[model samples]
Target chain A: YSVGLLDEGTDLGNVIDNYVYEHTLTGKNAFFVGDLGKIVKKHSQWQNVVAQIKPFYTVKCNSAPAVLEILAALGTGFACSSKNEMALVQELGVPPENIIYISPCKQVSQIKYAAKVGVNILTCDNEIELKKIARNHPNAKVLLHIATEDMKFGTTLKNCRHLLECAKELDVQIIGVKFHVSSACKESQVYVHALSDARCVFDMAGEIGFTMNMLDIGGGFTGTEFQLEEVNHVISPLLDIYFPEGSGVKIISEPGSYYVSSAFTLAVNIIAKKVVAFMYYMNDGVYGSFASKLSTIPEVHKKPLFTSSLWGPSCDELDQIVESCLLPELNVGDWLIFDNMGADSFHEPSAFNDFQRPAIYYMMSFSDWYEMQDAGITSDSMMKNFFFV
Target chain B: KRINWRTVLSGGSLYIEIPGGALPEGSKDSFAVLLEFAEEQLRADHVFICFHKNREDRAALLRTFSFLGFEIVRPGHPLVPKRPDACFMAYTFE
Candidate 1:
């Protein structure tokens, strides 16, 4: 659980190499090395571009303790979907006001837990969800989730009025609108349509005697500054036209991968190799850290790359991590490193295998650590397991 | 029809079909008992339990048997049944 405090001029590749060398000697299982500094830099870059809107880190992306603690220290709010996620954020000292329960359909017990913890802000897209909130958390303030194209989670634009009427009849408080543009979207028109729809919903709620003051443009940020800048370029003027700064509407967004995706690197050892079909198996797979079922091109320098597929240690046909890739011939004990794996990758180990979860080694550069302290995070307040190396 | 041990050896496996439709309560326990008896009493080394492809809970059944220490035998395996509409998994005891 110790974090390696790196010097200012240190290279992250060297740290990864050191860990890989150690694990190779011991024949240890797969592990992850998390760079807390990358998260700090990403936060700073986010503030530099989208300073007006607040960023709420989605807990489902990567709930690693260090990720949560660093984001919490940096004054970012959290977007939680389950009772356990809310509890995890609360344990790190994030108050209820700073955490929004954003699950569209919530279990009754989970709603009760949210009410018990005083997390009054919840999202609703249908009558049943609104009624459940009214019954379990009578005093809850709800955000009406509007549907975007290609997503099944939210309510349609045409259905917004009916849901607003239902909330009014149920006496539940409606305060905001939440909508998500898909991450795969590159066209700016999608945002234009979504924002226009949000404005319509806002007007509809206001006409129905509800004071809508919050607008949540939910997560579609893909952990790159260029993409963030492009999205901001498209939305900033739209926000000004739709809900201006003087309109008293607090704008926020749920950014899951934009904050922590590139901060963690997963190194998995090759436990078994089959030369017949050019298949390679790793110690970790979709059942563990690769739950996203996505992988980056492995770094290799073999003269000729051959068509290969990667499989998990599990026996299920669905356990394939990489369907097909051109990989150099790999040996049984060789290690493969996958980067940009910090988001929506880790999950509870499946019952199909006896493989344990990979160990996470947290690291931060001294300069970033100092910057965090300047932003009001102390070693005592953060993690006590700091080991300067 | 009785299964020929010679055919089983030539195919390099033996399989017992589990009823897929309308599994009653405690059916998993019943299958567990049958598996145990086949391994110990029948002296079967590699035992495969086959399920019809049309079973609604085929995915769940795969996971259930996997938890019970069985590994899925792909369709191309020599021991797997040639029936296209059937799924097979095997448990090996060392």
Candidate 2:
């Protein structure tokens, strides 16, 4: 457990390799290393880039207690998509008001649990969901959930007219509108158009006499400063035009992957390979940490004879991590590391064919943590089960 | 010597950013002179500097501001989010 916290300059991968050798770790396949310093650096960058808009860390990205602990300490709100996620943050000492149950559609029990826990801000995109909220948590404050093409939940410009009407009729506290322009979209213009639509909806709310005081721009920021700036560039001007200063509109965003994507690195061991078929198998594949592979990354390429295919250690044939990636010849026992694999990578890993979840390691290289070690920084300074050895 | 302050077409203000990565020797001195030129020659009272978080040493770049009397300020919107590592700080003429 190398906290890996080095001073000034350090190579994290080198420390991980040293740790692996020290443990003589073999056979068990893949694991993850979460760096706290990287998370600190990201938060600094977040403050630098998106200074105005507050971020509500989407707990669904990676619910590692260490990750959530730091985020909560930094005063970021939590965006919970489930009852358990809500409970986890609250357990971490985050207040209910600081938590937003963002799942547009919720189970009746989930609603009752959120209301019971005092997490009153819920999101609903359709009429049926509105009715559900009215029936279960009538005192709930709701944000109209807008969606991207992939999510299939947002209200379009045409449909929101009726959506708002229903909220008014149902006696729902129609606070504001929330839009998620899909996580896959890297285009800033998509956000620009989305903000325009949000502005239109804000105006519609005004005409309907609904007090649209808060705007939750659901998470899609790509972690890099440029993407954040690009989206902010397009949305900021429109926010001024529509919401303006003292306009009583509170702006917030649910940024999940942006905060932690660069902070995690998944390392996997190669257990088997076939040279003639250009195929290799890792301990974790599409069913494990690489589940995001099922969505974001490109599929396997066509290989006639001599190409590389990365597959999970599952008996099933389709458990391919990279169906057709022409990787350099990999031998058994060799390990591969994937950076930017933090989001949607760990929440769910199928134990299909009887393989267990990869072990997770929390690390930070020569950072403020070491400086605080001498003086006892805070109550929860050291992460549990972590050590220098 | 006068600093050539380029007028922005849309906003009617002059701005400049130090390119990222390693700064050339005396770049800090040159930057100081540029600030003086902006105030004396161009009659500008304030200047904004952006630091791009590339492979450059942040402490060294920060020294450029501390050394040149440029006080860091964060004013909501940036000139642009063109670079992933870019962040803003400001300086004003006495």
Candidate 3:
């Protein structure tokens, strides 16, 4: 008579509500009657996050059964970060039309996976990846991610010149230049610097010389509305500003926070809250990053700003979240809410305290609030139980 | 003129069979599906074809099947070339 929304982290428990039928007579193998409506209604806010990034959802993002089912029906594409994402996309029945597998440090496994499954949009940073791609996937369509700043993967202008020669050697056309924006930035149009640098990378390629068409400005748009608006306003105009003739520039970007943040909220009941000397101790701790927060992201996004160092239940000196965070004077049994949990949070965890983890509850779609009561999955309990064996 | 026909292959056993009979000899339409089972599936690296007993009809069928799809078979019977009466052929996939 009712429904419950699934928690994000540990939702899909041991029981699988969905069944995949492999009918030998019909030669058809696929899953059916899985709880889909229940998932979407509960997690609808996530769509807002994904749409903002502007990359389709075929990559690793499709692993979320609930997210994949809904997005596939809606005909959204994916921005894959690895071969796993690419193969996962294919397994999920994503059309070849919907994948963009981009990774700077791709190993042979990743390339062969893409080639086997026929993933077309590959972004190479330099000669090595280009040659590898050209060798295995000669007919592949590629997008080159140029290094604007000396950050991580992409090719700086110097090395990018070599990519052009390689593209020609492989008899492949160099289609476009790609760049990414980092977390630390002084100005929104600073991306234009990347654009200018990309032009030089292109010019170096052109000198070799071949014309490439489509510029993919890979993700890095933030969460706040102001930042979103700032990006939407400044980005295209800047592309036209520097790329003037627009020649082969088809502007595209993948914004993670733009789509991921603001999708859910964390509600933890403050079972016990006490203070010893001048410090406060709650049931949560430096695992606080795991509990109510994550590192590398601003704390304000998760919960109302309560800056205070939190100590764990165990006796360890290093076991504290904010050795000094600001918080409201509160008593035990009060409920606390934390928001803005990213994909990176659980995927990357460090040992800080003895505290374990938090739960994921979706926003009320009415749609959402219903998921809280009647819809959702959490089958991970079986794995946790078997971990000791 | 084009005629559409379909036959389903089921179970683990495989056999050589005729497609719908209207197609002409030395024609591409005779066999819609070409397979290399002995070589590809069984990993024996050989091809085989069976010719029926009616001599003229068998020659016509051979030309038809070859033009349609099957051709370049390896000798079938072990005593093939030494024995002139042996007509069936066998070959490898690669």
Candidate 1 TM-score, true structure as reference: 0.77
Judge candidate 1 at residue A227 and give its lDDT: 91
Model 1: CAPRI class: incorrect
> Taking chain A of candidate 3, what TM-score results?
0.64
My TM-score estimates for the predictions, one after another, are 0.77, 0.71, 0.54
RMSD to true structure for each model, in Å: 11.2, 22.6, 23.7
Off by over 4 Å in 2: A23-29, A147-151, A183-187, A296-306, A327-329, A348-355, A366-389, B1-94
Model 3 error, position A288 (Å) = 9.1
Q: Cα lDDT for residue A296, model 1?
A: 59
Candidate 2's TM-score reads: 0.71
Winner by TM-score: 1
Best by lDDT: 1
Off by over 4 Å in 1: A301-303, A349-355, A379-389, B1-94
| Residue-pair clashes per candidate | 0, 12, 44
Structural similarity of chain A in candidate 2, as TM-score:
0.86
> What lDDT score goes with residue A250 in model 1?
87
Q: Candidate 2 on A1-389: residue-level lDDT in tens? A: 34434555656656667655643464454567787766666666777766666789877678877778767766678888766777778776677777887754345556778778887887776666677688878788988766554302366777677888887888878887788765567666666677677778778887988777888888876677777777767776767777677877678888888877777777666677775657777666654455454333322211222556666665454455665654554467666667778876664332232436666677765555654354343446334434553
Q: TM-score, B chain, candidate 2? A: 0.63
